[PDB]
Amino acid sequence: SRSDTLFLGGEKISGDDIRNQNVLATMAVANVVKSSLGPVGLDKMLVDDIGDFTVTNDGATILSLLDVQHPAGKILVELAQQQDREIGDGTTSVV
């Protein structure tokens, strides 16, 4: 085992596990807002863990309120807020 470096708190995933963790982390942030788009699509409500709510169908703003844990997910959140700069709409879809 190892020795490699360096633990604890410092770790690394390799090849398959990462390429997977990356895809899962992406479908995560993705599959949440996969309902939004399309006229048939709906809106959602995000809770400020203090009661406060916020109803929105926007994909960009919705992903921001998510918190984006992980590099792969946050990478999409970053790609989202890019779209508003290009355009302003479709953030829900580009992801």
Binding site: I75, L79, Q82, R85, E86
Partner: protein
């Protein structure tokens, strides 16, 4: 370094990246670029039609002494004066700027706010907070000498240019100041672009390589053949100089045969090809054609000539690597015991 001959060269080139866009968006600038934005409506901007810059230096606020300043007031009329008089020293200083006719002003610190108004109706995109130590690059670029103190601000240090640009289009709305073009020469800049900021701090990195690779050619002109080809030669050459070496330095040297084989092996294995496969076939092509052009090409998915397929790397590239790994091993091999204690 063109027309200057070969030399050790340090990069004065400046690559600044805006997080907006994709890789390809990035482009060379025919002139100068600056990270700092304009004065914006602080304040009133770009780009003064035909332009004439200025490397303004020092403070720009109401004349204050580098010593204890205390404009005491005992009378009952010097109020008007004090306030009126200030508008003078901060005005004249401004007047002269336009007097010489330089279009633009550039100040690092302690500048003035009230004085911006007088500048507003003067058509000069005053720019503050410009790199304190940079003035060097900024100068050789815009051809404008630096201006220290207020009296000098002469028409001499004016940076003869034709246009200043402050764009904000294309994702993201964020803008960057572009300056073109300056009569002087010897400064080049490039603006990087990519989403996530990951691609910026990597497209930038993927340049300090491309760049340095060329200054390898400037520092020591010569190019070997990549694809592990350069490495393979040693396995053959060095091996012979071991047979006719005898003693104990035959196995040690044979070690450099056991070694260099990695570069081609991992190179090829990182593609999926058999480390045994291409290696073996390289041994032959090596002994047959003096490993002159032969090696492993990922694209070719086989063993063609590195030179034939334009696969090139500086002679320093792989030579300054070995010199290290060896002098390094020495260090590590000299280690016999490791103890710990506060240095």
């Amino acid at each position: 370094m063109d027309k200057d001959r070969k030399d050790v060269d340090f990069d004065l080139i400046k690559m600044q990246g805006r997080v907006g866009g994709s890789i390809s968006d990035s482009k060379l600038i025919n002139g100068v670029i600056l990270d700092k934005d304009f004065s914006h409506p602080q304040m009133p901007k770009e780009g003064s039609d035909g332009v004439k810059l200025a490397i303004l230096t020092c403070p720009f606020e109401p004349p204050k002494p580098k010593t204890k300043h205390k404009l005491d007031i005992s009378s009952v009329e010097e109020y008007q004066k004090l306030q009126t008089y200030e508008q003078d020293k901060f005005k004249e200083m401004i007047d002269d700027v336009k007097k010489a006719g330089a279009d633009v002003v550039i100040c690092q610190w302690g500048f003035d706010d009230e004085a911006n108004h007088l500048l507003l109706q003067n058509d000069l995109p005053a720019v503050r907070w410009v790199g304190g130590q940079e003035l060097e690059h900024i100068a050789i670029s815009t051809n404008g000498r630096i201006v220290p103190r207020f009296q000098d601000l002469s028409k001499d240090k004016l940076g003869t240019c034709s246009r200043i640009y402050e764009q904000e289009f294309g994702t993201t709305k964020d803008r960057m100041l572009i300056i073109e073009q300056s009569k002087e020469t010897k400064t080049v800049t490039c603006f990087v672009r990519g989403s996530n900021k990951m691609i910026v701090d990597e497209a930038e990195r993927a340049l300090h390589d491309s760049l340095c690779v060329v200054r390898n050619l400037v520092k020591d002109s010569r190019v070997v053949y990549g694809g592990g080809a350069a490495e393979v030669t040693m396995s053959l050459a060095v091996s012979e100089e071991a047979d006719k070496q005898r003693g104990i330095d035959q196995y040690a040297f044979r070690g450099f045969a056991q070694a260099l084989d990695t570069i081609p092996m991992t190179l090829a294995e990182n593609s999926g090809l058999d480390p045994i496969g291409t290696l073996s076939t390289l041994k032959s092509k090596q002994l047959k054609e003096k490993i002159s052009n032969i090696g492993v090409d990922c694209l070719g998915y086989g063993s063609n000539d590195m030179k034939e397929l334009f696969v090139v790397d500086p002679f320093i590239g792989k030579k300054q690597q070995i010199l290290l790994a060896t002098q390094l091993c020495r260090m590590i091999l000299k280690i016999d015991n490791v103890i710990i204690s506060g240095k």
